[PDB]
Design a binder for these strands. Structure first.
Ligand code: SF4
Ligand code: MG
Ligand code: MG
Ligand code: MG
Ligand code: MG
Ligand code: MG
Ligand code: MG
Ligand code: MG
Ligand code: MG
Ligand code: MG
Ligand code: MG
Ligand code: MG
Ligand code: MG
Ligand code: MG
Ligand code: MG
Ligand code: MG
Ligand code: MG
Ligand code: MG
Ligand code: MG
Ligand code: MG
Ligand code: MG
Ligand code: MG
Ligand code: MG
Ligand code: MG
Ligand code: MG
Ligand code: MG
Ligand code: MG
Ligand code: MG
Ligand code: MG
Ligand code: MG
Ligand code: MG
Ligand code: MG
Ligand code: MG
Ligand code: MG
Ligand code: MG
Ligand code: MG
Ligand code: MG
Ligand code: MG
Ligand code: MG
Ligand code: MG
Ligand code: MG
Ligand code: MG
Ligand code: MG
Ligand code: MG
Ligand code: MG
Ligand code: MG
Ligand code: MG
Ligand code: MG
Ligand code: MG
Ligand code: MG
Ligand code: MG
Ligand code: MG
Ligand code: MG
Ligand code: MG
Ligand code: MG
Ligand code: MG
Ligand code: MG
Ligand code: MG
Ligand code: MG
Ligand code: MG
Ligand code: MG
Ligand code: MG
Ligand code: MG
Ligand code: MG
Ligand code: MG
Ligand code: MG
Ligand code: MG
Ligand code: MG
Ligand code: MG
Ligand code: MG
Ligand code: MG
Ligand code: MG
Ligand code: MG
Ligand code: MG
Ligand code: MG
Ligand code: MG
Ligand code: MG
Ligand code: MG
Ligand code: MG
Ligand code: MG
Ligand code: MG
Ligand code: MG
Ligand code: MG
Ligand code: MG
Ligand code: MG
Ligand code: MG
Ligand code: MG
Ligand code: MG
Ligand code: MG
Lengths: 231, 137, 148, 208
RNA sequence: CUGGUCCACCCGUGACGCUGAGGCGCGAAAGCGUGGGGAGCAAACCGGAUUAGAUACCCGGGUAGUCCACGCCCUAAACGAUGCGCGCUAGGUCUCUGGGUCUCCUGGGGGCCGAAGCUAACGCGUUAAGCGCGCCGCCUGGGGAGUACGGCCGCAAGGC
RNA sequence: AGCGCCGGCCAACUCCGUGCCAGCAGCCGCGGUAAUACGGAGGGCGCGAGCGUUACCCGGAUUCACUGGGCGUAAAGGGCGUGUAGGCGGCCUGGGGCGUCCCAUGUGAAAGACCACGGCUCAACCGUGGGGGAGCGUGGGAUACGCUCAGGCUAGACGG
């Protein structure tokens, strides 16, 4: 499912703001820009997707993590396709390490779903309606994707392992495997299954994540053709 | 450069600690023998006589353990511990009866004997002592 | 279930206007006497809470010690800060020769005959941590050749 | 000499039943049955956690008070056992059990070791024929420990020996009743005897 | 007039090296001796303030000295409170100064942030306080005390 | 049958007397009218013809650190060069065999020490037998490392 002209969309970036541990995944710096060995990206995807597929057909969740503005929506898109949890907005410390406690906050969201499902007394004061609404709206912003996650994930998918340092550290502290799209400014050794490629351009994120989902959806029953994306 | 042997052991220790594939040490017959033992005991993958900018060297191919889970995924070293015993400042010599057991057998003592460079096991079999070069584990 | 031993329980203070206010800390080792031990340091505003909390971490952080006829496989020495612990294999008639802190941890680990020595700083906490990370570095003839 | 004083208070302090009298030890008039709490004004107050030192002291005193032996002889025997080959714990207990006054008691010649001592001391016992009036004599394998034929017509030994007719005697011993004589077969395992004693704690006490 | 030092060429010598108890030399300021010099400044000193007082701080004066030559003195928070040499162990960034092919690369300095590692912590981190070897100096609870005594040095002060 | 002890270290708690007094104290510390810390008592703990005290030695003290420590701020880098002795020293080959390693051998008295057996009723004590070792003398052997003598080398150092 992997394709070959990802060259058409990314082959890496960033001038010498690199992490030396990312050396083995670099071809050269042509424009004064670290360019990624796309053959390495291929070979890695082969190893990585193999892990993904196996995890899919054994029926276990993958928590997709993206928070940078460019990968914001694109992860809500494709993770929804998989029907798998994501965190798009703020990564709340202890989402894994303090799971049960954060999960105490979906119940609130849950209980606000029901209460506002009407009426169960709209005879609650004026000032309260506005409040609890603002609450639900609020809760909705952050726990929208995390609410699907009803128990500790089997692995996580990160768009930027550097940006998402905390998440990488939480999962790792829990022996939960970590798969990641990572460019030259990330730390390879911290990542279990690497996608050495640009993590900034939405194009690359789109290619890698959508095609990642195509692995997920295909392996747990049926398949499907193209998924929503901005040019 | 006062102790080539200690420099070599140290060149290795520094390299393994940051997980280099190999490392180069300036070459000598006596160093080869030590590496010979090091490889044949599995502390290193092996070595080869290479040349750096015209100069004879020994490229030592490092070996580690499997990647690990948890917060620190760096793999366990194969050579945890290597340090000189006999030094230019204080030569150390043992007779066959004074040869030490490194780490209850889990490690090796390398010595230079009048039968050549041997491990503590080897030296004890051949029944000879010598200068206690270093210990590895 | 495992066996528990409280090694250290201390009261500490913090200063505020109007006076000091206290908090308690508990060192607890946990083990089955068959090769599983764990160490946790629990602190809370009253003793029994702290002790229980210490129990929790003790179970979370465990370690597998490779017992052999009731002794450890090889000599090991470990430094934790200024605290240094020395561990030496010992034969059947020996017993566990150690101070209260490393004894408890070794004892619950199923060690029956060992020689030890505390060097450097003998801070109970740092010595307990050092003992653990020493056990954690014990290898077997198997482990050794497997690596190499 | 030996402790030679009130003996129930010893079991009471030690929190376990030590059988230091014989008969009354099995009666309901036993003190451990009536008041199983330490002697003196403070017996019924709640115990605070015993220190490690405390623990090992007690375990050692238990083992000691069992044999009515001095701390001196006790320590010497221990020191002998430590430098002696093998495992200290067994060897210590073995050497303890090899005391004449002890063997005399294990063979039912007496109800207590205190009584056994007075028997040995007063020469009413012999070892391989020869009279031995020293409680400290180390009985070795193959020794015949008999009543003195000049003392065989003694009330106490009789009533005691009557009580032993088919009564079992430890695997390491053999008693020929009616003949009033017994034999020492071999030195007893820690296993081969069930003393209310963790003898490792004694090792730890003397390593302080 | 004269020392150190860096670079490029890789031309010559062929381990000629490292350190270094003693020794020798250098060694800020203040101070000393002989002689000059003396504007400004300024110990001591005199006066005015301030203040409860003010042998100070502030103000107005003011002599050594501060400067030059020669000879002494030999101390210091003489500090990076970090001996010298060599090898090894991510990088990022600013800068000084060489050589490239001048994007940038590579030498030698001077900073900053940081990999691994170290550290009691603070912090250090290719200008190590990391990992090693060599040699030297030094520490071994606080005060008494860098005092006394002895010795050596100094004109003295006083130094070791 | 006695002696010490019962605040923590450190095993053993209460009543009275006292009221920063009398006194205790190895260290930390106790005593100012409800003292488990002084004095007695009851009780308890520990040893027992002994128990405690003073003195001194080794230990705990890796607190002179060979095993086995340190010196930025804790005590600790010489103010800095220069250099004498000394310590230490790159790559290859050969001679010698000094250090070093191995074997043989002589010496290592007896007592003591350790294992076994045995004699005094046991023990202490004593007898009998057994196994060593370093160290040095001698003989033969080994040559990797260190040393030395010899010959090459250019990677250190120096010079053009
Ligand atoms: S009677 Fe009960 S208490 Fe008194 S000695 Fe016999 S066992 Fe011990
Ligand atoms: Mg990025
Ligand atoms: Mg050494
Ligand atoms: Mg410490
Ligand atoms: Mg340290
Ligand atoms: Mg063993
Ligand atoms: Mg200390
Ligand atoms: Mg202390
Ligand atoms: Mg293991
Ligand atoms: Mg009984
Ligand atoms: Mg215990
Ligand atoms: Mg023994
Ligand atoms: Mg039985
Ligand atoms: Mg019994
Ligand atoms: Mg002792
Ligand atoms: Mg040339
Ligand atoms: Mg030439
Ligand atoms: Mg000098
Ligand atoms: Mg001067
Ligand atoms: Mg001057
Ligand atoms: Mg002057
Ligand atoms: Mg003058
Ligand atoms: Mg002058
Ligand atoms: Mg004059
Ligand atoms: Mg003048
Ligand atoms: Mg003037
Ligand atoms: Mg004035
Ligand atoms: Mg005035
Ligand atoms: Mg006045
Ligand atoms: Mg004035
Ligand atoms: Mg003025
Ligand atoms: Mg003026
Ligand atoms: Mg003057
Ligand atoms: Mg003058
Ligand atoms: Mg003057
Ligand atoms: Mg001058
Ligand atoms: Mg000087
Ligand atoms: Mg300065
Ligand atoms: Mg400097
Ligand atoms: Mg200084
Ligand atoms: Mg120096
Ligand atoms: Mg230029
Ligand atoms: Mg430049
Ligand atoms: Mg630089
Ligand atoms: Mg820094
Ligand atoms: Mg770090
Ligand atoms: Mg260090
Ligand atoms: Mg480097
Ligand atoms: Mg740098
Ligand atoms: Mg520099
Ligand atoms: Mg330091
Ligand atoms: Mg002093
Ligand atoms: Mg002076
Ligand atoms: Mg002075
Ligand atoms: Mg004088
Ligand atoms: Mg000085
Ligand atoms: Mg006492
Ligand atoms: Mg009190
Ligand atoms: Mg005591
Ligand atoms: Mg107590
Ligand atoms: Mg009075
Ligand atoms: Mg007293
Ligand atoms: Mg009061
Ligand atoms: Mg009172
Ligand atoms: Mg007292
Ligand atoms: Mg009292
Ligand atoms: Mg006596
Ligand atoms: Mg002492
Ligand atoms: Mg010592
Ligand atoms: Mg040392
Ligand atoms: Mg120290
Ligand atoms: Mg130093
Ligand atoms: Mg200082
Ligand atoms: Mg300096
Ligand atoms: Mg020099
Ligand atoms: Mg010289
Ligand atoms: Mg030399
Ligand atoms: Mg050499
Ligand atoms: Mg030679
Ligand atoms: Mg030769
Ligand atoms: Mg020789
Ligand atoms: Mg000999
Ligand atoms: Mg002899
Ligand atoms: Mg006999
Ligand atoms: Mg011996
Ligand atoms: Mg010879
Ligand atoms: Mg030569
Ligand atoms: Mg050169
Ligand atoms: Mg040159």
């Amino acid at each position: 499912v992997k394709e070959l002209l990802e060259a058409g969309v990314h082959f890496g970036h960033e001038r010498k703001r690199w992490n030396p541990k990312f050396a083995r995944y670099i071809y050269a710096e042509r424009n004064g820009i670290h360019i990624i060995d796309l053959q390495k990206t291929m070979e890695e995807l082969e190893r990585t997707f193999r892990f993904i597929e196996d995890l899919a057909m054994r029926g276990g969740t993958i928590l997709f993590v993206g928070t940078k503005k460019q990968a914001q929506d694109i992860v809500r898109m494709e993770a929804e396709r998989a029907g798998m949890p994501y965190v798009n907005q703020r990564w709340l410390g202890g989402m894994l390490t303090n799971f049960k406690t954060i999960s105490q906050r979906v119940h609130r969201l849950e209980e606000l779903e029901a209460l506002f499902a009407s009426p169960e007394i709209e005879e609650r004061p004026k000032k309260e309606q506005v409040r609890l609404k603002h609450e639900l709206e609020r809760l909705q912003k952050y726990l929208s994707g995390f609410r699907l996650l009803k128990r500790l994930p089997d692995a996580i998918f990160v768009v930027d392992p550097t940006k998402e340092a905390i998440a990488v550290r939480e999962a790792r502290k829990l022996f939960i495997p970590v798969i990641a799209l990572a460019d030259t400014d990330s730390d390879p050794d911290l990542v279990d299954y690497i996608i050495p490629g640009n993590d900034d351009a939405i194009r690359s994120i789109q290619l890698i994540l959508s095609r990642a989902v195509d692995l997920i959806i295909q392996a747990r029953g049926g398949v499907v053709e193209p998924s929503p994306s901005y040019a | 450069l006062t102790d080539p042997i200690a420099d070599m052991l140290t060149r290795i220790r520094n390299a393994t600690r940051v997980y280099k594939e190999s490392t180069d040490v300036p070459a000598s017959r006596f160093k080869e023998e030590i590496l010979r033992i090091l490889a044949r005991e599995g502390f290193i993958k092996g070595y080869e006589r290479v040349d750096v900018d015209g100069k004879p060297y020994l490229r030592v191919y490092l070996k580690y353990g499997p990647r690990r889970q948890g917060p620190d995924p760096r793999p366990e070293q194969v050579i945890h511990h290597i340090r000189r015993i006999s030094k230019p400042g204080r030569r150390v010599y043992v007779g066959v009866k004074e040869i030490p057991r490194v780490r209850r057998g889990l490690g090796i003592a390398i010595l230079s004997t009048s039968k050549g460079v041997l491990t503590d096991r080897e030296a004890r079999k051949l029944g000879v002592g010598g200068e206690l070069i270093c210990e590895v584990w | 279930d495992f066996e528990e031993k409280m090694i250290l329980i201390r009261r500490t203070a913090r200063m505020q206007a109007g006076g000091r206010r206290f908090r308690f800390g508990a060192l607890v080792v946990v083990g089955d006497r068959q090769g599983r031990v764990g160490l946790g340091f629990g602190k809370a505003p009253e003793v029994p809470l702290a002790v229980q909390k210490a129990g929790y971490y003790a179970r979370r952080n465990m370690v597998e010690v490779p017992l052999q006829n009731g002794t450890i496989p090889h000599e090991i020495e470990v430094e934790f800060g200024a605290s240094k612990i020395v561990l030496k294999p010992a034969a059947p008639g020996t017993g566990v020769i150690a101070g209260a802190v490393p004894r408890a941890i070794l004892e619950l680990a199923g060690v029956t005959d060992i020689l030890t020595k505390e060097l450097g700083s003998r801070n109970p906490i740092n010595i307990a941590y050092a003992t653990m990370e020493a056990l954690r570095q014990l290898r077997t003839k198997a482990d050794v050749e497997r690596l190499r | 000499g030996r402790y030679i004083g009130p003996v129930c208070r010893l079991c009471r302090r030690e929190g376990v039943k030590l059988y230091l009298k014989g008969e009354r030890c099995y009666s309901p008039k036993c003190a451990m049955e009536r008041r199983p709490y330490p002697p003196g004004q403070h017996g019924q107050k709640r115990a605070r956690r015993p220190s490690d030192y405390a623990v090992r002291l007690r375990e050692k005193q238990k083992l000691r008070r069992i044999y009515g032996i001095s701390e001196r002889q006790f320590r010497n025997l221990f020191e002998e056992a430590s430098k002696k080959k093998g495992v200290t714990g067994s060897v210590f207990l073995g050497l303890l059990e090899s005391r004449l006054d002890n063997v005399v008691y294990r063979l039912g010649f007496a109800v207590s070791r205190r009584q056994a001592r007075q028997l040995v001391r007063h020469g009413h016992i012999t070892v391989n024929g020869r009279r031995v009036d020293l409680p400290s004599y180390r009985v070795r394998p193959g020794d015949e420990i008999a009543v003195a034929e000049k003392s065989r017509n003694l009330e106490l030994i009789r009533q005691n020996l009557e009580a032993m007719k088919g009564r079992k005697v430890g695997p390491w011993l053999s008693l020929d009743v009616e003949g009033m004589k017994g034999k020492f077969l071999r030195l007893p395992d820690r296993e081969d005897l069930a003393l209310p004693v963790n003898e490792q704690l004694v090792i730890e006490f003397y390593s302080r």
